[PDB]
Ligand binder design. Sequence first.
Ligand SMILES: Cc1ncc(COP(=O)(O)O)c(CN)c1O
Ligand SMILES: *Cc1c(COP(=O)(O)O)cnc(C)c1O
Lengths: 453, 451
Amino acid sequence: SSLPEKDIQYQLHPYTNARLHQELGPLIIERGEGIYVYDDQGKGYIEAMAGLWSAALGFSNQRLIKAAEQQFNTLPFYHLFSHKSHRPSIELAEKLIEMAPVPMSKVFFTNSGSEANDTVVKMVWYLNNALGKPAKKKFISRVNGYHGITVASASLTGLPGNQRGFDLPLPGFLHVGCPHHYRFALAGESEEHFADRLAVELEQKILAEGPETIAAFIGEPLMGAGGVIVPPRTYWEKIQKVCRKYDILVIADEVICGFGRTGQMFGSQTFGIQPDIMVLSKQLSSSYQPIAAILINAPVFEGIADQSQALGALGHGFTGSGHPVATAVALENLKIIEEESLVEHAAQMGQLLRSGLQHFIDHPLVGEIRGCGLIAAVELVGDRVSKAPYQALGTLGRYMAGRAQEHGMITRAMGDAVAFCPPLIVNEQEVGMIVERFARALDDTTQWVGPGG
Amino acid sequence: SSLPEKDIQYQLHPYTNARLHQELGPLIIERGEGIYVYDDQGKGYIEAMAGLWSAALGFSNQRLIKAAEQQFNTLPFYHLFSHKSHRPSIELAEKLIEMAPVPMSKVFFTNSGSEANDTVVKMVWYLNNALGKPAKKKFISRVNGYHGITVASASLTGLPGNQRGFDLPLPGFLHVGCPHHYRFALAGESEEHFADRLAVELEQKILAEGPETIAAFIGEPLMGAGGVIVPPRTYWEKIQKVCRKYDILVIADEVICGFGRTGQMFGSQTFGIQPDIMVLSKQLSSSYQPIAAILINAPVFEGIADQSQALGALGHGFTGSGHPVATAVALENLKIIEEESLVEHAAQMGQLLRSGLQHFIDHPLVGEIRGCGLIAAVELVGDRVSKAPYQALGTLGRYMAGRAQEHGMITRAMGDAVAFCPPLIVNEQEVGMIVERFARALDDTTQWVGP
Ligand SMILES: Cc1ncc(COP(=O)(O)O)c(CN)c1O
Ligand SMILES: *Cc1c(COP(=O)(O)O)cnc(C)c1O
């Protein structure tokens, strides 16, 4: 029995068509090194997505690996329940609070981003009950935002693909508009007037629902999985004014943006967000270990704290919350990012990536090139004037990603946009190779479509 | 400045009184070895809970540690999205299906048990939509069952402590009775007649709600966190008849019972459960890595599979689903359990534990001693006739656990019951030490309650 046959027999794959997978089987990844991964046929790929927007230090950082070993051989598992604690969790939490872009009080650990946001939901409901505001429970998020896939976090998520067939969203989970100018501005509307209109939509939803009932607003500084959507200029400023105006919490989902992805350490810095709560994962540990972290500010903590006392204890926690190996790896991961000045380096590499892609700005199939820092996307279209897809929406993106893989590069399509989110350690010539391989895929795709003009 | 000061400054602790924690600070655990952990003052404790019911191979198994290293140096992270895969996930899924106590089709990986059950809920809703039964969505679980703490999995959970202040449970999440004879049988009622009444309660709830609306029943074979509650004889047989009778899925939550805890490899074996879906974690990896697994049978898979095609792809998955290091460690973990015959050894050690605790059956503060395999609990009461707590529920359990710690043993109180769930590798004399330290805490607690 072959390894692909076993995979087809025994695994149900996430984000995969199960029937198609029975026919095609897997692409088996065997090993990784630097920014590369290699399949079981020996073929090498530049992992331009850093796996899942996550492997900041690439796929063979020995320091992370040794940090795991050292912790394993000390204390391979323990927990944080009932006052129990341990050094790595404590030192990681310290570090996270000291590097926070706004004053923060406490860290709560989970395994995943989905768990983290699911936990943030519970925390907010518990908070407002403590403050004697039992109706202030509803969450507002955006269309195409992604925040995980638990029943609750998938209700925060605004991608239909995460909701169809799952009876989601739940009640109490509301969605306002995707802040993507290219797709949702009115013709002749500026970015600033687009922002104004989005801020007005929000105020209108708050009033229509009853401000007293709205607990929180959650957003990725820029949207990752939904298309590498940069919000229009002034979006965050104006959205925050509306939130402060109705005493609504601002939650920044920094699962992707966190730790140098957007040109600064956090997307909250890059986009001037002053969040009450932040959510972190992915680059936190370069995904070498499953871990996520929630940062909460003083008011949120004090409320939760009072209530935990009134009720005996805080009735919430995962077995793996603050896992010593995962926290130890994350701690070392963050140190490395500081010591090797990878935020500033990622910013420089980002400028190269973007400049290199922009040689294609006038290509007949390129509708928009977007991004900031070391995250980017090229959205292809069949017609630039109408912005319509070639064939069905997603056809170009799917063909490109296929061709990129053929040319030794792994990118993810999101509809007809292809993303780039390489490891932070990518070097100058590697960025060139990424753009080259993008170009070869574009060329192939262009031959295939035959635009004329 | 000091490590405890940092913890107080920067960490919000789960299952902890936050204000009390600001005053007392943490108990910092520095290192582990065998069944022991040591605090930062050098003091050693028998981890009689195996951490969180989980550390099957104890706290210094070198083989798990090497398996991690070997995987780290090969491929330290990758994912299973969009047809991507990798050896450890594949080989682990193979093994899990091989060793399943009933025929199973597929494995889906998560990081946690809470994620797993939360995922099982979504899967069942997605399944029944695929089959054109859009009303068949409700879940039935039990009072005092524990199934995790996501918004949904905490609604499956039937412990009020996980629901107060969280606006839970959600609608669609229903609870029938805790199958705990000592607390809920009528005077003079046999275990079998208790079972009958519970099976009738369930049928009645199904009919009262509309069988067409009931998707699934979920249960831990025996309840862990809710008190180490062994169901009465015939409970599972009768509950299953009721479920098959209304085409209701049976989900076995084996997060604790999995991998030799109850005397056999699974609680489903020990209690004759033939589940459609199983949920696994904890001893899966001795908690050396955060990982959980869902096993689904053929019908569940085929429905989900068709739907994933209709909708383009299965719109669900965690970044860490099937993580190569966690799956690699779990794979080695399971091999070790087989190779060292720890299921049978745990069973023997379980006999010793339970027989040692039984010397305290006639103690004035002991209401019930329960368990099977290598999981057990002693429930203290203020009065044995009435079964009432001293002072208020949880006061005795809290004091015992405190005293046990003083005597070098870590146990968890669940109300006024103290639990035992030691590593599978515990040896005979270590079981004696556990019982001795239990005894010293009981003595202290008894002097404290006093005349
Ligand atoms: C029976 C059971 N099910 C589910 C869970 C949830 O596990 P996790 O803590 O990994 O979310 C637990 C955790 N103690 C459990 O005991
Ligand atoms: C991928 C992602 C998540 C979910 O994290 P998991 O660890 O996959 O549950 C949450 N938020 C954002 C912004 C993400 O991109």
